[PDB]
Design a protein around this ligand. Structure first.
Ligand SMILES: Nc1nc2c(ncn2[C@@H]2O[C@@H]3COP(=O)(O)O[C@H]4[C@@H](O)[C@H](n5cnc6c(=O)[nH]c(N)nc65)O[C@@H]4COP(=O)(O)O[C@H]3[C@H]2O)c(=O)[nH]1
Ligand SMILES: [Ca+2]
Ligand SMILES: [Ca+2]
Lengths: 177, 178
């Protein structure tokens, strides 16, 4: 009984993703048309959503990994395009952001009146990802312009490598079928 | 056993109410100085939160009742938008307060119209009441809550102005009574 993640996932979809995802692919499409000659290649058309299961969302992506560098702004019709580095070389680019409702789960774990433990938090974080994936599976503003990147960090970790893996898998899918 | 309302209430508290509420009474007092000098008025001290159980949230308060009349923006001191309204009886100023709908009810209503949710009007109403109860429970133990906010939950069959005025008057009674 009592899972905050249910409502967090539904509200993130209804009050956010549903609104920005269609036309997100249109600002990336437009961007690619306009700027492909400056851009060595293209930006993935999907929004990449980081879901760290520890619920740790920093104010700047590069703080989590120096191999993730801000590249440019996606013009409106806030979203930033990031470059992913391997040995100082650009290995990929994409629109990246953390799933904001994970900050609620973290804030709750530090709020004592909630009776919400770090153990509860991890469990609700996983539940958030599961519920959100289910929602996006049947949504018209499809999964197809959105990808969930859920990861549990150990106790060294490369977030950029984690993202690069999804990018490379996505391109494989695109060209195989 | 699903219960979207649990997350919505915790989310509304954590990501909004606990942020806005600590500074609320100072922003109101500051405004009250000028409101009192200029018009001999006084804005109540608590954030009034409308929780219609039908989850109907207009983009303009007056549309739900023309006796609820927008007066001003409450000045800052993040960037939070709060509106001060005058409440009217027979064209006369009966009261004044910071007033707004609980935004997460819009999520409940949007879900209602989203067929893939399998979320009916019956679920929506049940979840709206749970949202109210859950939010109440949270605010009971919340430090940012003095109380410096008041929940106005109501099922409709109507005067919203009269519903709110009734709370404003009950609040003033308590203030001068104890
Ligand atoms: N990256 C990103 N994520 C976004 C954005 N907008 C919404 N989200 C995400 O979606 C969650 C739910 O948004 P909601 O439906 O508007 O639900 C909101 C809303 O109902 C209410 N709320 C938040 N801010 C305000 C406000 O300034 N005024 C009022 N009246 N309500 C607010 O509190 C609920 C909880 O807010 P959150 O904790 O912030 O949780 C947000 C946030 O995690 C965005 O522009 N960028
Ligand atoms: Ca092919
Ligand atoms: Ca109504």
């Amino acid at each position: 009984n009592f899972n905050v993640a249910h409502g967090l996932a539904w509200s993130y979809y209804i009050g956010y993703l549903r609104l920005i995802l269609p036309e997100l692919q249109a600002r990336i499409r437009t961007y690619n048309q306009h700027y492909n000659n400056l851009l060595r290649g293209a930006v993935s058309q999907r929004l990449y959503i980081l879901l760290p299961l520890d619920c740790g969302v920093p104010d700047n992506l590069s703080m989590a990994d120096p191999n993730i560098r801000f590249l440019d702004k996606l013009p409106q019709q806030s979203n930033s395009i990031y470059e992913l580095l391997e040995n100082g070389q650009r290995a990929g680019t994409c629109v990246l952001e953390y799933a904001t409702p994970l900050q609620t789960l973290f804030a709750m774990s530090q709020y004592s009146q909630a009776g919400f433990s770090r153990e509860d938090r991890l469990e609700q974080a996983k539940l958030f990802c599961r519920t959100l994936e289910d929602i996006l599976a049947d949504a018209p503003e499809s999964q197809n312009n959105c990808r969930l990147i859920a990861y549990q960090e150990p106790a060294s970790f490369s977030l950029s490598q984690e993202v690069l893996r999804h990018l490379r898998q996505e391109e494989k899918e695109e060209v195989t079928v």
